[PDB]
Design a protein around this ligand. Structure first.
Ligand SMILES: [Mg+2]
Ligand SMILES: [Mg+2]
Ligand SMILES: [Mg+2]
Ligand SMILES: [Mg+2]
Ligand SMILES: [Mg+2]
Ligand SMILES: [Mg+2]
Ligand SMILES: [Mg+2]
Ligand SMILES: [Mg+2]
Ligand SMILES: [Mg+2]
Ligand SMILES: [Mg+2]
Ligand SMILES: [Mg+2]
Ligand SMILES: [Mg+2]
Ligand SMILES: [Mg+2]
Ligand SMILES: [Mg+2]
Ligand SMILES: [Mg+2]
Ligand SMILES: [Mg+2]
Ligand SMILES: [Mg+2]
Ligand SMILES: [Mg+2]
Ligand SMILES: [Mg+2]
Ligand SMILES: [Mg+2]
Ligand SMILES: [Mg+2]
Lengths: 100, 51, 205, 68
RNA sequence: GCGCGACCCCAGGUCAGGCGGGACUACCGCUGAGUUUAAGCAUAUAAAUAAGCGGAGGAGAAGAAACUUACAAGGAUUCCCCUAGUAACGGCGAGCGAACCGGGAGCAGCCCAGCUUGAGAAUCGGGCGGCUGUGCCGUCCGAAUUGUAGUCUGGAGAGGCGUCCUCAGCGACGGACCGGGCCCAAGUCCCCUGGAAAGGGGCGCCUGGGAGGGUGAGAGCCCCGUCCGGCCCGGACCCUGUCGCCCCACGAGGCGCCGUCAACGAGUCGGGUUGUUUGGGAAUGCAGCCCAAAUCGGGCGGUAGACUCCGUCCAAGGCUAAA
RNA sequence: UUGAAACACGGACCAAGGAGUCUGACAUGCGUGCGAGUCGACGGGUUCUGAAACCUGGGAUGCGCAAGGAAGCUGACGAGC
């Protein structure tokens, strides 16, 4: 961000000094999905299949019940952050199949 | 039997004196070394010393 | 309990007499550390006895950010800007810290100058007798070399006190220092309500 | 750790030293590092290092210095 | 009427090996009270203590951030001071009670798994033989492709290019530290008392030695010792100090650019609930059971919750001195 | 103990031992030193009978120098009888 305002109070309080930009670090790609790993993980999905709750979630996403798709996912996975993401993931799988 | 109030090693063996009070006392001691009557009275045979 | 005294609160209800730590070995601790330092000095001679070079850092936490002290080690950028390779620095007496960051330019500049200042007064013996490879030194240099002791690069904790004299100008006398503080505090606490009234503007208006 | 194919592997020689006898009975394997609270570092784990009992002893000590 | 090959199991007084028990100061793991205090007593406290069951070393444990902070931010672990009898916790009672910052002691960082030998398992054990012998060499069996070696570990890295810049060992003598044996100043001069002179008086001497002890009573000089050091013998050493010969590379590393790649630990994390523990308070750690992940993803920012932004770090494998 | 010579208890005698201490927190008083300061108490340096003594740091460590508020916060404009 822009450096502080030079004043001890208020927005952007603090001591002015030339702010600077930090080069990307390894682990600034941390979590970035990659080709071969995704290739392996997709392939296992057809071989392995779907968990029973993952099957249940899509069914309600197939009816159109977005809320319950999230609400079932949450009681299973535990948190809204993971439940929100898994619903989106099931919705994605649903749109790569029911497209045809 | 055991003694009343057995002595322990966490008695206060060492006592602290202010850095400045130590220096003041050294100054007083040095001055008294320059007084013949006090060097005599403390027991030193100083009777053929020149000065 | 009785007369107007302070409320007693001594924590002596456990078996505290089994964990009494006395300090009768304090003078012996000083001697063992002195012998340890002295023995270490010989086994590292001629390398300096203070250790590797430490960079300037500002302390954390409001109470101390105005004071400079020694940090763990130089960042990778400080090392690379001064042109000291990453894996050579600990071998020539310069500590490294792969974790520290450079958010403000002045700090980075200050620690770069230390590395050149250190490099200027650094001398390196050859790895063998007569071969002189890169980074080595002249025989004259290697005879003038002694074991420097103490703090060969001191760190000034903070800004020296200076009370200059200037002329008090009309703008200076008009400026409201207290008025500035109260209006700037005001803006901080209205930040949400102002942004909300703004935010709802584009939602409705 | 008596097998010569182990004693000549630099990556596993450490397990032959006497300081590693019965690592599991002293809580020093991965599972041991787990139930000892050592998976984590900051506050929320500071009492577990060096050990919970070593931390307790240190906090129990009455330090009566010579000049006090 | 077979003989196969592998898989999983046998039994061997088979070849060669490693295990158990002992000691308690300090260290690591488990289990676990009550007396007592609260002027009664049950949560609490005593105490995450005593007892009980085990496991180590010369130290042990911890250790290289899924850390703190909110700052101009800092930067592994441990210990001391301070923080601080503080924030907090508590029949908010009796009581209990840390951490960050800061200042010191000491400082050091490493290595794996995974896509990446395929013209080629380049790796490793054992028998036997030889030699320079804590190892190296030859050969024959075997382990291992359900994966040994090499690369690589996020700070990166694989590639590509490039003036460049960097790399091999053994002698010889030592210095230090370690143990041991020996050698080393000067009155026992004269008188008195006394069983005994080491006491008194006289006259002398040593002292870088008047620490201590013995010897028939307060002995520097009688003896052993003490000071200053001298000598001779034996070690461990893997630390560095110089002379000698050998000369490091087309392999790897550094550094300059590139942007194409860029792999990173799963009944684990995480959530619920139960019990314990904590100063940790809508839950500090730990453990049972249930549910059970992700890869523009994950863990945190000390009040539970949804969204936008911001700071921060990268768990689920391992080693690591010093204080 | 209100009251003991007591029909209250303890004491046959003698020798030796035998009970308000040490530590931590606080308070008042007194002594010493310095004084808007004051502490060198964890360390470092130096020290040849001394585990002593002596030097050093502190530009902010503790206490004091400013208080009222639960907090966000604000913070003594100069005394007369
Ligand atoms: Mg328990
Ligand atoms: Mg008790
Ligand atoms: Mg009671
Ligand atoms: Mg009672
Ligand atoms: Mg009772
Ligand atoms: Mg016990
Ligand atoms: Mg260890
Ligand atoms: Mg205080
Ligand atoms: Mg407790
Ligand atoms: Mg003699
Ligand atoms: Mg005589
Ligand atoms: Mg004698
Ligand atoms: Mg002699
Ligand atoms: Mg709990
Ligand atoms: Mg370890
Ligand atoms: Mg009566
Ligand atoms: Mg009567
Ligand atoms: Mg009676
Ligand atoms: Mg009687
Ligand atoms: Mg008596
Ligand atoms: Mg002060």
């Amino acid at each position: 961000s822009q450096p502080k305002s030079g004043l001890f109070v208020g927005i952007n309080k603090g001591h002015v000094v030339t702010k600077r930009e930090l080069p990307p670090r390894p682990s600034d790609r941390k979590g970035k999905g990659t080709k071969r790993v995704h290739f392996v993980r997709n392939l296992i999905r057809e071989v392995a299949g779907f968990a029973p709750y993952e099957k249940r979630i899509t069914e309600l996403l197939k009816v159109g019940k977005d809320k319950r798709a999230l609400k079932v996912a949450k009681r299973k996975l535990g948190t809204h952050k993971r439940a929100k993401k898994k619903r989106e993931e099931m919705s994605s799988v649903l749109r790569k199949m029911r497209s045809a | 039997g055991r003694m009343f109030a057995p002595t322990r090693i966490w008695r206060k063996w060492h006592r602290r004196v202010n850095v400045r009070l130590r220096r003041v006392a050294v100054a007083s001691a040095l001055a008294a070394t320059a007084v013949p009557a006090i060097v005599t009275a403390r027991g030193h045979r100083i009777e053929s010393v020149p000065e | 309990v009785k007369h107007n005294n302070v409320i007693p609160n001594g924590h002596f209800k456990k078996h505290w007499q089994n964990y009494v730590k006395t300090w009768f070995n304090q003078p012996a601790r000083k001697q063992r550390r002195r012998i340890a330092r002295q023995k270490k000095a010989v086994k590292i001679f001629p390398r300096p006895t203070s250790g590797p070079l430490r960079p300037i850092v500002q302390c954390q936490t409001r109470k101390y950010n105005m004071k400079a002290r020694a940090g763990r080690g130089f960042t990778l950028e400080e090392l690379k800007s001064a042109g000291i390779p990453k894996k050579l620095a600990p071998t020539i007496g310069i500590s490294v810290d792969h974790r520290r960051k450079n958010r403000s330019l002045e700090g980075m500049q200050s620690n770069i100058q230390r590395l050149k200042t250190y490099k200027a007064k650094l001398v390196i013996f050859p790895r063998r007798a007569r071969k002189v490879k890169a980074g080595d030194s002249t025989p004259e240099e290697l005879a003038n070399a002694t074991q420097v002791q103490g703090d060969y690069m001191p760190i000034a904790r903070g800004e020296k006190r200076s009370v200059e004299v200037v002329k008090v100008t009309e703008e200076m006398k008009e400026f409201k220092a207290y008025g500035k503080l109260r209006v700037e505090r005001m803006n901080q606490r209205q930040l949400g309500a102002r942004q909300k009234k703004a935010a709802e503007a584009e939602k409705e208006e | 750790v008596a097998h010569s194919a182990v004693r000549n592997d630099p990556r596993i020689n450490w397990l032959c030293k006497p300081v590693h006898k019965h690592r599991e009975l002293r809580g020093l394997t991965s599972a041991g590092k787990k139930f000892r609270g050592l998976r984590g570092k900051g506050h929320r784990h500071h009492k577990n290092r060096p050990s919970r009992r070593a931390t307790w002893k240190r906090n129990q000590t009455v330090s009566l210095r010579r000049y006090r």
